[PDB]
Design a protein around this nucleic acid. Structure first.
Ligand SMILES: [Mg+2]
Ligand SMILES: [Mg+2]
Ligand SMILES: [Mg+2]
Ligand SMILES: [Mg+2]
Ligand SMILES: [Mg+2]
Ligand SMILES: [Mg+2]
Ligand SMILES: [Mg+2]
Ligand SMILES: [Mg+2]
Ligand SMILES: [Mg+2]
Ligand SMILES: [Mg+2]
Ligand SMILES: [Mg+2]
Ligand SMILES: [Mg+2]
Ligand SMILES: [Mg+2]
Ligand SMILES: [Mg+2]
Ligand SMILES: [Mg+2]
Ligand SMILES: [Mg+2]
Ligand SMILES: [Mg+2]
Ligand SMILES: [Mg+2]
Ligand SMILES: [Mg+2]
Ligand SMILES: [Mg+2]
Ligand SMILES: [Mg+2]
Ligand SMILES: [Mg+2]
Ligand SMILES: [Mg+2]
Ligand SMILES: [Zn+2]
Lengths: 66, 83, 101, 52, 239, 146, 90, 81
RNA sequence: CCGGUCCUAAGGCGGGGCCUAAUAGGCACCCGCCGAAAGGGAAACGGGUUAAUAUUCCCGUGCCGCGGGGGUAGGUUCUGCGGCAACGCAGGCCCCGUCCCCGACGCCUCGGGAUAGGGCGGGCGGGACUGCCGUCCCGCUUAACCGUCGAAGGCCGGGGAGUGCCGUAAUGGCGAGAACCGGCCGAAGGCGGGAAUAGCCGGGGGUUUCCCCGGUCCGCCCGACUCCUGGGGCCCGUGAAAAGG
RNA sequence: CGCAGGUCGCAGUGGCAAGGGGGACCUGACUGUUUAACAAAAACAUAGGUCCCCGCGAGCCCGUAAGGGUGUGUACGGGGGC
């Protein structure tokens, strides 16, 4: 598993994921892009997570809550 | 594999698991780093810890790279320029 | 002085070690500007520590702060162009720890 | 010590194993031949006339 | 049974052999060295009697020589007839001036060096007889011999001298030395055995033996073996 | 089957701490699987007795007394407790870092520093307080060291 | 500074037109600051952490890295909580 | 190459819970040959083969069928259950 | 992905040859091979499951070797770029050769850094006891793997020092280049990701092991015989080799 | 780690754990080794001393032989006695 801090970098893997897992906390949200090779995690502010989640759904990437 | 763990060839590493057990992991020791062909000292840029063979190590950007130290190369070039 | 404008040198350290160049400018007691033309020898134009170049007995006549084509025309005047393409080869098997203590 | 205590050391080692040619527990693993039929040192079968 | 210790040694059992795998290689001249070389290493070799120099020739040939005293790592040495008689140089014996101390002396050219190889020893070049290609040398024992003038020697004395002047203070110290050598350690006196195990073994008051002739057979040829004389009188007659 | 062997694996405790209620003696003969044991554990008919931890109440009371100076007299010592070699290491580091700081701040001249440095190494000073008194008594600094 | 090797590589990669590498070096710069500062806070080396956070705030301004600001705010919040507990205990 | 099926309590549990059939084969059969034989005889797809040699000298294979074929259905079809 | 399997050690066997009345007897020579389940050496960890296997089954998260597809950097006579330098950075592709290095190494001793483990005070939950006191006990965990950071040590640039000056646990260091300033390479391990969704503890409801709820915390200390690092000393003793990289 | 004070017992390293000491002679210098199953020693070994055979195609030893050990060695060395 790998951690990415930049949203722009993470989206390259997020757009190609088999599934994106969402784990919510009070101050941040973990988004985990499950690719065939690696699980890519990014921590984002909750407002950013909603925007990112909407874009992934619009690109027909599966999003699940864990 | 049990007498193989009685020898000190492998590191005995004690680790606690997420299940609450403390186990011993038997791990390999580091390989020696590349050394200068003249002085035998470790070469700069290549003395990182490596635990298995088959891993490509990048040599410094210099003629003769990870073969001799910069000190040996500079002196040998000074000799050749004159000679 | 040996390391002067026009003195041909061979860099001994760095990525460009072993390549011939020419001193074109003097900055201070530690640094001179060498540009053994990049298209000719592979040394780009920048300052260099005088401890990282070995002087050669060959010297050319050029002006202070000379440019790359002025250096190029002077090397062919002295007929050293093919000299400035050969890279010095060390003989590592003749070095012993006594020399590099 | 030569009796019962020393017998304790015959618990783990071996001189002979089973021979692939004759099947007896007679193949000397160090010498690499069979003490009964000679396999490994003799292509002919070992058998002496002093043996019945 | 009854074969005595000297007879069992010849069978070459493990306890009588030299553990020569502990060493890097034989210390001998290669047959075709010439030119200049560099001393690249000076090493301790287990079981040897002197430090060993590793020499690299210009053509990349490496060989082991016993290190001359004063030889240093990085020194340039010269091999051949043109070589000056300086310490560490390897010269044909017919070219070495008289009165010169030399070591690792070949008896015939190409044998690799035979005489004056132990630490602190040397041979003296006494004379030259070039009409038959012979050099006269004095060996460490004092014996004067003739050698092939084309054979090679090294200039100087063997390094590591004075080793035997310091006592082996303990039995354990000699024990560790013996393990790098071929010696059987330790030794039992003949008169400490029973008669079946030695000619000296036996009686209620055990005694040594009188000398045996040179024709004595193995198993009888122990003690003094065809000795010219014994004791202090023999040393006096030797002088 | 031995129900205690199975129960210990399920409860994750030693067999020595598995208790089987005597009211379930009728049901012990019917146990076949570990799931059967899990039924009995759920019904409370099999449980684990809490482990014993040695109580430290007596030790904690004694530990406070020893901090006040009690029970460490001549008659209670059987061997060496003070590491003399470690004491030297502490003594050198305490003194040297004090003297080296004074020199780095310019309060001590290097000639005076060297004399005190060698005197510290020579076991002249008993402790840092003794070193300070010597410095103050002999006016080795412009201002007294606290 | 601790993460100056990454600052130079970003300039070097950008000056060469390597947009992909400049992004990767940008990621490594944030990793260097956040990972090191987080470890210092976890070990309660608050002074070492604060110097990293100060430098982190400057390079975030220099390179316009929004995610660096978000993670610095999180770590500063944890630092104040640690300091709050210390002062109360004192 | 197949000698018989194993229909023990353990084998039947692995059929229902892990989609595996258990067979006894010739001791010299390899995992490659076992997978080929099962596919040819029964027209299923084999995911993987685990093998062992029993203390009585017989080779046993736990053959996991791919995710479109039922181990329980195959045993019923063969009439070995 | 745990061992064998591979490699060579001390040594051994076979063919050829030489010896032998002869062999199934001997072996200095040539060729090959064998020789370690404690040496060298590719790659897996945690949780769950069974009557009985568990790094092997199942779940999750990975790694190695070999091969292929796409993208990218790069290339397409000719060369990658930066830095005074130590050295840094995606550093094109295929074949062949040579060299070097790693593999690869004792004992004694003493400084430094960690981790396993242990403890103290507070908190939350649960347990023990009853004559008096209210104390005592248990849980509060975090694998491999990815990233980043890196102590000692070494090195680079500046500097240019004898009224010396800088030190250590100890030995001490310096125009054969000190102090001091800036930098480069660089452990165990830390931390984030893994990962709380697991496990544990407590409270409930089912049924046959499934579901729900709450906690999984704060601040300190000791600390190895385990792991890492460096300094010093000893030897008439010097502490393997090869595969592989 | 120390100081001052109070105090109990027959007994305070209270159990556990834990040298009796000194003088002299003979003898082997010492540590070490030994009769597995009646001998542990003053016996063997030992460092040190000394003598002998030997310049290497040697000396001494093994093998029927081919050949071998010492020797990957060389008198500050190999072997053999006391
Ligand atoms: Mg092994
Ligand atoms: Mg090892
Ligand atoms: Mg017997
Ligand atoms: Mg045997
Ligand atoms: Mg021996
Ligand atoms: Mg006797
Ligand atoms: Mg007799
Ligand atoms: Mg007689
Ligand atoms: Mg007699
Ligand atoms: Mg007490
Ligand atoms: Mg002391
Ligand atoms: Mg198997
Ligand atoms: Mg093999
Ligand atoms: Mg079991
Ligand atoms: Mg507590
Ligand atoms: Mg000390
Ligand atoms: Mg007692
Ligand atoms: Mg005695
Ligand atoms: Mg007896
Ligand atoms: Mg007895
Ligand atoms: Mg005696
Ligand atoms: Mg005497
Ligand atoms: Mg006599
Ligand atoms: Zn047989």
């Amino acid at each position: 598993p790998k951690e990415i801090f930049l949203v722009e970098l993470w989206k390259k893997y997020g757009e190609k994921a088999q599934v994106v897992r969402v784990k919510r906390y009070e101050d941040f949200v973990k988004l985990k892009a499950r690719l065939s090779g690696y699980l890519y995690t990014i921590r984002v502010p909750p407002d950013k997570a909603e925007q990112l989640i909407s874009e992934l759904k619009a690109k027909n990437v599966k999003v699940e809550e864990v | 594999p049990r007498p193989a763990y009685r020898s000190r060839s492998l590191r005995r590493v004690k680790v606690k698991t997420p299940g609450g057990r403390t186990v011993v992991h038997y791990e390999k020791r580091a390989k020696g780093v590349p050394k200068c062909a003249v002085t035998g000292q470790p070469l700069g840029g290549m003395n990182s810890k490596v635990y298995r063979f088959g891993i490509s190590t990048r040599a410094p950007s210099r003629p003769y790279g990870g073969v001799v130290s910069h000190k040996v190369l500079a002196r040998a070039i000074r000799y050749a320029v004159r000679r | 002085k040996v390391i002067d404008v026009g003195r041909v040198v061979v860099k001994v350290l760095g990525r460009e070690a072993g390549r011939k160049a020419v001193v074109v400018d003097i900055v201070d007691e530690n640094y001179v500007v060498i540009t053994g033309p990049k298209s000719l020898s592979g040394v780009r134009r920048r300052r260099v520590n005088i401890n990282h170049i070995e002087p050669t007995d060959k010297k050319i006549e050029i002006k202070k702060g000379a440019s790359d084509e002025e250096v190029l025309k002077a090397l062919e005047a002295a007929g050293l162009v093919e000299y400035m393409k050969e890279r010095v080869k060390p003989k590592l098997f003749e070095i012993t720890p006594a020399d590099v203590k | 010590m030569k009796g019962t205590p020393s017998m304790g050391k015959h618990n783990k080692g071996k001189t002979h194993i089973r021979c692939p040619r004759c099947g007896r527990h007679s193949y000397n693993v160090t010498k690499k031949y069979c003490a009964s039929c000679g396999w490994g040192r003799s292509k002919r079968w070992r058998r002496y006339n002093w043996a019945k | 049974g009854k074969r005595i210790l000297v007879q069992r040694r010849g069978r070459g059992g493990s306890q009588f052999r030299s553990p020569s795998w502990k060493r890097d290689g034989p210390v001998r001249y290669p047959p075709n060295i010439s030119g200049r070389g560099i001393v690249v290493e000076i090493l301790h070799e287990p079981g040897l009697n002197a430090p060993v120099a590793k020499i690299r020739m210009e053509n990349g040939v490496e060989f082991f020589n016993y290190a001359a005293e004063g030889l240093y790592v990085g020194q340039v040495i010269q091999v051949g007839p043109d070589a000056p008689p300086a310490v560490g140089n390897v010269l044909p014996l017919g070219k070495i001036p008289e009165g010169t101390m030399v070591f690792n002396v070949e008896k015939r050219f190409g044998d690799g060096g035979k005489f004056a190889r132990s630490g602190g020893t040397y041979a003296l070049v006494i004379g030259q007889r070039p009409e038959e290609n012979k050099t006269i040398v004095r060996l460490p024992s004092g014996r004067v011999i003739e050698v092939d003038a084309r054979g090679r020697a090294t200039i100087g004395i063997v390094a590591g001298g004075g080793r035997v002047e310091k006592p082996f203070v303990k039995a354990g110290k000699k024990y560790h030395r013996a393990r790098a050598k071929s010696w059987k350690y330790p030794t039992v006196r003949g008169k400490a055995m029973s008669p079946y195990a030695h000619p000296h073994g036996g009686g209620s008051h055990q005694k040594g033996g009188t000398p045996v002739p040179k024709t004595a057979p193995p198993g009888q040829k122990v003690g003094f073996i065809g000795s010219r004389c014994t004791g202090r009188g023999c040393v006096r007659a030797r002088a | 089957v031995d129900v205690k062997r199975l129960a210990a694996e399920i409860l994750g405790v030693g067999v020595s701490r598995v208790k089987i209620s005597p009211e379930a003696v009728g049901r012990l003969e019917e146990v076949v699987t570990k799931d059967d044991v899990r039924a009995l554990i759920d019904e409370g008919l099999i449980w684990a007795e809490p482990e014993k931890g040695n109580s430290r109440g007596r030790w904690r009371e004694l530990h406070e007394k020893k901090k006040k100076g009690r029970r460490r007299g001549q008659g209670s010592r059987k061997g060496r407790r003070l590491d003399e070699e470690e004491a030297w290491v502490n003594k050198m580091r305490v003194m040297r870092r004090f003297l080296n700081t004074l020199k780095r701040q310019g309060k001590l001249d290097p000639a005076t520093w060297r004399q005190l440095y060698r005197m510290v190494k020579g076991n002249y000073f008993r402790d840092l307080r003794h070193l300070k008194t010597y410095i103050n008594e002999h006016k080795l600094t412009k201002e007294p060291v606290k | 500074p601790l993460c100056s090797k990454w600052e130079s590589l970003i300039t070097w990669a950008e000056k060469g037109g390597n947009s992909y590498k400049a992004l990767e070096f940008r990621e490594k710069l944030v990793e260097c600051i956040v990972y090191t500062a987080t470890e210092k806070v976890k070990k309660k080396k608050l002074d070492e952490a604060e110097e990293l956070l100060k430098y982190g705030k400057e390079v975030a301004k220099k390179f316009n890295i929004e995610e660096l600001n978000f993670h610095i705010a999180l770590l500063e919040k944890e630092i104040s909580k640690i300091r709050q507990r210390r002062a109360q205990a004192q | 190459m197949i000698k018989r099926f194993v229909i023990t309590e353990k084998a039947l549990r692995l059929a229902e819970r892990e989609n595996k059939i258990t067979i006894i084969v010739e001791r010299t059969a390899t995992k490659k040959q076992i997978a080929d034989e099962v596919q040819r005889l029964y027209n299923v797809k084999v995911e993987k083969v685990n093998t062992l040699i029993t203390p009585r000298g017989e080779k046993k294979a736990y053959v996991k069928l791919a995710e479109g074929y039922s181990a329980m259905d195959l045993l019923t079809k063969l009439g070995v259950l």
